[PDB]
Design an enzyme around this catalytic site. Structure first.
Site, PDB file in Angstrom:
ATOM      1  N   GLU A  35       0.830  -1.204   0.000  1.00  0.00           N
ATOM      2  CA  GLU A  35       0.000   0.000   0.000  1.00  0.00           C
ATOM      3  C   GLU A  35       0.874   1.267   0.000  1.00  0.00           C
ATOM      4  O   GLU A  35       0.621   2.206  -0.760  1.00  0.00           O
ATOM      5  CB  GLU A  35      -0.983   0.013   1.184  1.00  0.00           C
ATOM      6  CG  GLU A  35      -2.086  -1.067   1.173  1.00  0.00           C
ATOM      7  CD  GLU A  35      -3.234  -0.795   0.198  1.00  0.00           C
ATOM      8  OE1 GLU A  35      -3.251   0.261  -0.462  1.00  0.00           O
ATOM      9  OE2 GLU A  35      -4.137  -1.652   0.087  1.00  0.00           O
ATOM     10  N   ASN A  46      -7.555   8.617  -5.964  1.00  0.00           N
ATOM     11  CA  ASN A  46      -8.385   7.602  -6.600  1.00  0.00           C
ATOM     12  C   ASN A  46      -9.193   8.225  -7.739  1.00  0.00           C
ATOM     13  O   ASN A  46      -9.475   9.425  -7.729  1.00  0.00           O
ATOM     14  CB  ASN A  46      -9.335   6.953  -5.581  1.00  0.00           C
ATOM     15  CG  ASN A  46      -8.646   5.918  -4.688  1.00  0.00           C
ATOM     16  OD1 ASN A  46      -9.299   5.012  -4.167  1.00  0.00           O
ATOM     17  ND2 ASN A  46      -7.337   6.043  -4.513  1.00  0.00           N
ATOM     18  N   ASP A  48     -12.250   8.112  -8.364  1.00  0.00           N
ATOM     19  CA  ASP A  48     -13.530   8.642  -7.896  1.00  0.00           C
ATOM     20  C   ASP A  48     -13.413   9.993  -7.177  1.00  0.00           C
ATOM     21  O   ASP A  48     -14.408  10.535  -6.692  1.00  0.00           O
ATOM     22  CB  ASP A  48     -14.252   7.593  -7.023  1.00  0.00           C
ATOM     23  CG  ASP A  48     -13.624   7.419  -5.635  1.00  0.00           C
ATOM     24  OD1 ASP A  48     -12.519   7.944  -5.372  1.00  0.00           O
ATOM     25  OD2 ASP A  48     -14.256   6.750  -4.791  1.00  0.00           O
ATOM     26  N   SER A  50     -11.590  10.560  -4.443  1.00  0.00           N
ATOM     27  CA  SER A  50     -11.103  10.353  -3.090  1.00  0.00           C
ATOM     28  C   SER A  50      -9.584  10.200  -3.118  1.00  0.00           C
ATOM     29  O   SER A  50      -8.972  10.114  -4.187  1.00  0.00           O
ATOM     30  CB  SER A  50     -11.773   9.141  -2.437  1.00  0.00           C
ATOM     31  OG  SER A  50     -11.359   7.934  -3.045  1.00  0.00           O
ATOM     32  N   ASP A  52      -6.224   8.213  -0.911  1.00  0.00           N
ATOM     33  CA  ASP A  52      -5.766   7.283   0.131  1.00  0.00           C
ATOM     34  C   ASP A  52      -4.594   7.898   0.880  1.00  0.00           C
ATOM     35  O   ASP A  52      -3.768   8.591   0.290  1.00  0.00           O
ATOM     36  CB  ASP A  52      -5.344   5.933  -0.460  1.00  0.00           C
ATOM     37  CG  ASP A  52      -6.465   5.229  -1.202  1.00  0.00           C
ATOM     38  OD1 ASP A  52      -7.650   5.345  -0.808  1.00  0.00           O
ATOM     39  OD2 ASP A  52      -6.151   4.544  -2.195  1.00  0.00           O
ATOM     40  N   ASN A  59      -8.861   5.553   2.882  1.00  0.00           N
ATOM     41  CA  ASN A  59      -9.541   6.349   1.871  1.00  0.00           C
ATOM     42  C   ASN A  59     -10.433   7.442   2.459  1.00  0.00           C
ATOM     43  O   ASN A  59     -11.013   7.277   3.533  1.00  0.00           O
ATOM     44  CB  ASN A  59     -10.352   5.426   0.957  1.00  0.00           C
ATOM     45  CG  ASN A  59     -10.852   6.123  -0.276  1.00  0.00           C
ATOM     46  OD1 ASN A  59     -12.000   6.563  -0.322  1.00  0.00           O
ATOM     47  ND2 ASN A  59      -9.990   6.258  -1.284  1.00  0.00           N
ATOM     48  N   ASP A 101     -15.397  -4.248   9.186  1.00  0.00           N
ATOM     49  CA  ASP A 101     -16.564  -3.724   8.465  1.00  0.00           C
ATOM     50  C   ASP A 101     -17.355  -4.823   7.766  1.00  0.00           C
ATOM     51  O   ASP A 101     -18.486  -4.604   7.348  1.00  0.00           O
ATOM     52  CB  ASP A 101     -16.131  -2.644   7.455  1.00  0.00           C
ATOM     53  CG  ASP A 101     -17.281  -1.744   7.012  1.00  0.00           C
ATOM     54  OD1 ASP A 101     -17.961  -1.164   7.879  1.00  0.00           O
ATOM     55  OD2 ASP A 101     -17.503  -1.610   5.792  1.00  0.00           O
TER      56      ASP A 101
END
Ligand SMILES: [Cl-]
Length: 129
Positions: A35, A46, A48, A50, A52, A59, A101
Site C-alpha cells: 500500500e 483515486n 472517484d 477520493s 488514500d 480512503n 466492516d
C-alpha cells in the site's frame, strides 16, 4: 517517516494488530508494504476523487476527512492528514474499524491481490517481535 520492516512490525504489534480479527502480523506488514512501501506520508488519488492516506492507504470517502471528497463520511472521525504522522496510532485505530466492516482485509485491494494466500510470515522473518 519511512519505517523499517521489523520496525513497523513492532509498532503494529504494540498497537494490537497482530491477530486482530484473525489476521496475523505478517498480513498487516505485507499490506503496508504494497500500500505505502512503509512510508507514513504516502498519498494517492483515486479515480472517484477520493484520496488514500498513510501507511495503510486509508480512503477519504468513508474513513477520514480531507475536505475535498464530495459525499464523504469520516467514520474514523479523524482528519486524513493525521494518517500521515510518524506515529501510526491514528492509522491503526482506523484500520481496526475498516477490517471489522465485514469484508476483512479484502477492503485493501492490494492485500487481496498481493498478500492473501501467500507466505505472509515471510514479512516478519528475522524480527525480534
Ligand atoms: Cl475475515
Amino acid at each position: 517517516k519511512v519505517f523499517g520492516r521489523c520496525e513497523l512490525a513492532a509498532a503494529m504489534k504494540r498497537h494490537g494488530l497482530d491477530n486482530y480479527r484473525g489476521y496475523s502480523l505478517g498480513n498487516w506488514v505485507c499490506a503496508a508494504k504494497f500500500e505505502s512501501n512503509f512510508n507514513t506520508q504516502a498519498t494517492n488519488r483515486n479515480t472517484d476523487g477520493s484520496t488514500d492516506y498513510g501507511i495503510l492507504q486509508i480512503n477519504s470517502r468513508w474513513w477520514c476527512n480531507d475536505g475535498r471528497t464530495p459525499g464523504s463520511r469520516n467514520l474514523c472521525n479523524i482528519p486524513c492528514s493525521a494518517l500521515l504522522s510518524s506515529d501510526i496510532t491514528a492509522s491503526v485505530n482506523c484500520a481496526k474499524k475498516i477490517v471489522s466492516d465485514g469484508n476483512g482485509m479484502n477492503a485493501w485491494v492490494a492485500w487481496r491481490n498481493r498478500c492473501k494466500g501467500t507466505d505472509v510470515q515471510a514479512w516478519i522473518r528475522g524480527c525480534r517481535l
